[PDB]
Amino acid sequence: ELLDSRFGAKSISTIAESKRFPLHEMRDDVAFQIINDELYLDGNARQNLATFCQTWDDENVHKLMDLSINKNWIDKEEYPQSAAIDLRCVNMVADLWHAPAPKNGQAVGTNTIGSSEACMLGGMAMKWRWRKRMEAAGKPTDKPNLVCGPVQICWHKFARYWDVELREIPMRPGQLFMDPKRMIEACDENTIGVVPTFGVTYTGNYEFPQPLHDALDKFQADTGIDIDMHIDAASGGFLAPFVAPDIVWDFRLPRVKSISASGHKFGLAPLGCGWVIWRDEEALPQELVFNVDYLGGQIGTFAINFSRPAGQVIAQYYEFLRLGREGYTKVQNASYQVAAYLADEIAKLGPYEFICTGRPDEGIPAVCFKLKDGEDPGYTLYDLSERLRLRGWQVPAFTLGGEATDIVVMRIMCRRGFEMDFAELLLEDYKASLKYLSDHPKLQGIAQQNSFKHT
Amino acid sequence: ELLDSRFGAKSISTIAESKRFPLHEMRDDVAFQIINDELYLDGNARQNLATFCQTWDDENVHKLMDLSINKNWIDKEEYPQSAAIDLRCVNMVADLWHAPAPKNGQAVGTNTIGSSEACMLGGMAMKWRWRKRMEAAGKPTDKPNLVCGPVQICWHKFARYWDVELREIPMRPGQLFMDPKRMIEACDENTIGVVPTFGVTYTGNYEFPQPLHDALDKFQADTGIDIDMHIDAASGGFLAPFVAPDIVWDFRLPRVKSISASGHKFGLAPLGCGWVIWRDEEALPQELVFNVDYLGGQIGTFAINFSRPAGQVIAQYYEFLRLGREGYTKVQNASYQVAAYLADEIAKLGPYEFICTGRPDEGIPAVCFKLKDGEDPGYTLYDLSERLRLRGWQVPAFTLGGEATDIVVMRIMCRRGFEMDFAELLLEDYKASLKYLSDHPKLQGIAQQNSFKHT
Amino acid sequence: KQVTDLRSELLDSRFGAKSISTIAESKRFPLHEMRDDVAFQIINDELYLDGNARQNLATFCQTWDDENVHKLMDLSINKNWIDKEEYPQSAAIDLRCVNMVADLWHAPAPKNGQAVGTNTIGSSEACMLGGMAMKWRWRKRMEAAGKPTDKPNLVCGPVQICWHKFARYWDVELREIPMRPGQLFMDPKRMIEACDENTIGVVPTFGVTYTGNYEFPQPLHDALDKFQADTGIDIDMHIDAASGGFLAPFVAPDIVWDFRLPRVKSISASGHKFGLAPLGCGWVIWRDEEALPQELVFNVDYLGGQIGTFAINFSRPAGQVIAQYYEFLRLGREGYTKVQNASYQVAAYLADEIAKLGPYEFICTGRPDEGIPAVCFKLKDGEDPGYTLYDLSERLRLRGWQVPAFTLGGEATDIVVMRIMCRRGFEMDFAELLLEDYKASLKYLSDHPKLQGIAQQNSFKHT
Amino acid sequence: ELLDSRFGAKSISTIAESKRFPLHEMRDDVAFQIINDELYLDGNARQNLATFCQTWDDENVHKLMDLSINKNWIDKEEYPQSAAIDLRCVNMVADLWHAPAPKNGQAVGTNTIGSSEACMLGGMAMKWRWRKRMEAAGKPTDKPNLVCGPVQICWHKFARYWDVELREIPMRPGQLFMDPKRMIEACDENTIGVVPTFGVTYTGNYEFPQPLHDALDKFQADTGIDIDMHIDAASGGFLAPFVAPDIVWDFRLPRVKSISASGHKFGLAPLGCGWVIWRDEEALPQELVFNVDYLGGQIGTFAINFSRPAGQVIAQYYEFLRLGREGYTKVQNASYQVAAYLADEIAKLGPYEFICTGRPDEGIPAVCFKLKDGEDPGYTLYDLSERLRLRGWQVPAFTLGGEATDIVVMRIMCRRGFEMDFAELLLEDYKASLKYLSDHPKLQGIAQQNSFKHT
């Protein structure tokens, strides 16, 4: 019966006998080749403008990852040097965010797999601080709520997974984020804390912690209710410090007790890297820290994951070391330049409304636009997305949350390796698409599938 | 002024300015070299018998991991084929654990970073399942407890972070594990479930689910109280199915609603891979599952992390494809023969009483022993542990938990790579140590430091 | 009543097939073939048992990996050094090194364009070549004089073991000036005493293996000149510059030790020590044509005329010469100075810092004008700080560091020293880490008094 | 002014500033490329039929040699595993040559850089053995001699360096080797030993040690004088034990007290590896062995070299383990079948007389032939040799020593990698050279340069 043209031998079908555990062994390199070949069906992401996550390859990151394939992060004993490098990073990130100079030399924070993990960790201490304070006073502590904006999905999880009532201030037309006013309306003694999104996923815009900080101070005076903040700087955290160092959002704000960020977003780390830093020893409840015994003393951890590769910490460190402040500033500005240029060029092409023009002071390096209300140029942005996909380009169109469920937007993400010249290409394909849509009016209204929007 | 003999130029110390974010850029290949050089301080782990995790390099895994560096586990859209390989592995693991053949062709479960995340996930599902049952019966739900043996630390965490009373049945002399009787005294209507550890971290013994299962059956008959189980098969999950298949521990038992294991332990997968499988649709409360829109429809995920590499999943598949049931049976067998050899040989070298002798029907491939009571051979197992460390071997000695807190043990872990030849090297260095310790009596009692134990 | 499913043969977990032991029948020559990749993987796997040497502070030899050196070595795996015909370009490179090394040591300008000297495997080969050369030069001078040649002797200081061998193998009587407290080196006075009409030569060691100090050839050279005026005995030197040989000419070029001294007839050194050559490279250079007795040089025929060799080894790889040429070429005078300086800066820092932590007396504080980049110290006399240097070495080993504590020779058999060697790739950052581990160790020994005096094994001291 | 076309920079010449030590730095890659480029002027040896040494590249060997570039043979302490391997080899080789089973489980021998060092060692042991014995009898030990045959240059070296009178028995027409009768005549009380060369460099025939052994037995019966042997098995050492094991040449013969061989000749190791084995303990004088101290005991070495790579020993081991007896037999026979084929075919091409035709029982895989006396086919072997070179082939013609100064031979060496297909091509170029010389009668007797002949 069946032969394979690669091997010149009897066929082994990954798609049959994929319902059960395999019975027999297979020659090693044959297994390797079968799998390798089917990976060619994966995209490479170079033409993907939806994703936040690092997609550019650096030959040096590959080597570091490869050496670190078995280095256990949780094993501080066998891999003391990796452990050291980790602790360094914790500090360097702490510093980048203006955390108070730490007491003994070592800042209160931890590496994580991503911002998802950093956030629940952020959330758990937030809930714990609120709880303790609340038992102290002698009041019920069974109904905690969290106040926030158009948060990324992980916050919704935390909410459910931790039994916290989520008051997400709903998106609405010409009022897309958490403003002072609607925040204060959602706060009372049962609020564990307020979570501004420093770099909203859906739109790219910054939520500005400073106006929000003011309203929480006035709140305290008025009601004697003290409220903390946690900044989800999933992408913000490695942009602002460099391209807008005078946006005050970080630890410079006394209410911020912790900040998290994805290193594998604008932090230039490979996939698998996240950070969270607490203001000081006191932001982090001791009941959450578990001290594990090892050979030269005992290190306490607050983390969900246990064993895992230390590869990404080493990489993150390598980016940190090679670039520095000076170097990050050049990288991030390169991207803002591309975003900005795309924003200026895309306005010329249709009747668009910009939620985000890719400006260092308003948000991350991303262009995000919607069709001007009740204007009809002969196509939806879904339709336009589709023509562009026929050109290799993943540019997502979708609907926003809240009360702006109505609105369809397009969002372009300018990450590292999307240089000016590709930008150029995109625009040539972008125009080609308008022209084709123009010449075939029947193409209007047909596509309607929301794309992957969450990272 | 300071210079470096690698680079014959101005010194760049990573230990100076290691507390703040660096200002200036560095040549990319110097930064790489600086970090590469400092990783040689890390152990290669080949002589470490403390860890459970994979440390054997295989060129084909290295290659797969390297291709997979930017592949996003959470992005089913752009990496449609990794998405596929992940779904197969879920299926294949379900099968391995005797999951009821899945109704629509896809088993209920999910990849994870490790058992840590897989156990919380399972724990969460326990807590919700129980809640929903009490609510229905109109009863209070404020005091949930979990009943278990000498569990790996990850469970202490679960209890803490999710407000569950952990009834850890205490280790005691001649009574090291969770027995049916002590298990029953700890149970009540608030018990969200029982967790046997099918491969105890501290000693290597299996807690056999079957006797405990009987006890719960009798308990339900007596009280009306229906208690579920989740098996912590961290190591046991990829051992018994192959070398001891008629130990009845898995979904063959009606109460076991979910199983978890480490891919990076005896799963043979590289660091950062774990599995959890649920019996059927009803073991997973829907409220826990979050739906993400993409282009080809929408997928539901129950998972703490978000973005993270697909490398591991793919490597874990390669393992499955290349080995099969046949393959793994031989691989696990090889380990068991070594531990057995070691336990049989070591029993001759001193007054030792074994808690674990590395037999496939008792536990994982590990040797675990303590000094006989009232016998004094002229050294403690800490003393021996240090002599060994001088000849490169990491053979941990530590003390047990609960009421066994008195007991010092030494535990030798046998994993892939640790072949009979090396076990021979180890025996020689063992004997040489016993001899030096014998000629140098003064050394007795000096070392007293607990080694990293939890994995 | 059973539950397992087991196979009745030893299995390997790597290959999922029958076990094959390296330990069983490693006592006879193997009978059967094995799959190549399996043989490779078995051997490679048991090489992870070797140290990587990065925290070895005992050894002199080069241990830092450079990607370019790996590639030259790999290209040269089959390049036979002795085959001047097939590898003529390897042959010219080798010649270029000899010239360069002569220039570096102030050998008088070669009359025909080529210096007198040869590459070797290491200093060992070099010194015996040097010693045969010395022995023969003497021999001839005495038969001319019609005096007996059957009782030769050699006069030197605390030499490296290789001179003990030379002396044994070649029936030369060894007059080793013994070591002794506050006089650890072959001084003018004592040298003179051992010398008579049977002394083939004097061997000063430019950079001592045991401590790291230079014996300074100049003062010994003056003693010898004075010795000739008195007795009429004309005595030659050969300098064992095993490590000094690539240090001083860059960081202390006014220390006069080389061919600027007329009694120096040959110098040897190890390329794979401070030469920055990978393992397997040495050099001996002769002052000139007359320094090398014609009877030692064997003339081999090859296609483009005939070359003469003075070597113990024959067939062997040109990998190291090529690599050592690369070093020479990329670094140059400008560069070696920098590289070498870096290392001296590490020794100097280690010494200044280590002094602060206990009752030590330093034999060698790693200073460009006194010796190589090495710290050597002993415990002060009649002082007990609560450990011996042996014990400290053992706690230190427990953190990965191999820092040798051993006894010295001659009459300082009584004295125990610790010796740190700073070589390329042991940078200031590491030094730091060592220090932190050294303090830790002190603190551990302090809290554990019973530990004192138990350890007494000598470490490998010889390179 | 002057520029380099490779780097579009100022020229840097290696033939200029290569009279004195360079003054300046140079970029690391530029140096690399400069040297690397000139190495293409070196030949690859694939077409060189002069050399005995290993020239065939195997990918597995490259990798091991590259792992061991820093691994110090003399540093038993830092590289314990290499030390173990090195020792295994001494045993394996010992076994191979039928040494008596060693007392304490470790044969008396050592790895060397080559046969040359290996003979020097054997050499000194011979002189010492004789010195000791003669002192014991109260006799003069100032006039030692060595009896031997057409030795390789290392013995001429040994005789000079260590003041021994070399009594070489000279080759002469019709008798090219040390025979029993001329052996006996050169022997006396001052003979430190006899050295038969087990595979003569200049012709490829074996000197057969047995009928010499007889002569030494008969000699001792008559005179009372006892003479020992050392076999120079540079090449034959790793041929005979596989293709012709009942040639009695090794430790079977009681008077053999040491044997030496080149690994990098027929023992298949890369350049830089030799072996010398002693019959037992007593074969090796204790004054020759130096005892270094190290941390886990003390090892006595006997060797001229100190620090050097262990790369080749590890390589040599790899060749032993992967090939075994069965493998080597196959390997070497293939070399002989080429040799045997060349001899038969060359024969058909003109008026030659053979000294050696590549038979397993007479010598090594080598063809060696001279012109028939008083015949003139129209060229000298020197002239043939030159044409052969124009077609890329190194095939040495040269004269023999002593009394055969009159005889010019060609010697073809058949080593691993010179397979049947290349034999064929050689012939096709041999045939054409002969036709050219035929057509150009003027070329005759012009060339007259001896080739490198010594290995």
Ligand SMILES: *Cc1c(COP(=O)(O)O)cnc(C)c1O
């Ligand atoms: C992408 C995103 C996340 C998810 O973070 P991961 O690193 O992908 O786990 C969380 N918060 C925000 C604001 C995001 O944009």
Ligand SMILES: *Cc1c(COP(=O)(O)O)cnc(C)c1O
């Ligand atoms: C090691 C271990 C764990 C932790 O697993 P990771 O895969 O390292 O997250 C959990 N449970 C048990 C029983 C273990 O042995």
Ligand SMILES: *Cc1c(COP(=O)(O)O)cnc(C)c1O
């Ligand atoms: C290292 C050393 C030697 C031996 O050199 P090798 O190249 O290792 O043979 C000789 N003399 C001195 C002074 C040494 O330090």
Ligand SMILES: *Cc1c(COP(=O)(O)O)cnc(C)c1O
């Ligand atoms: C080449 C050769 C030698 C020399 O040994 P090397 O391995 O080249 O150092 C000695 N004897 C014979 C017969 C040889 O052919």
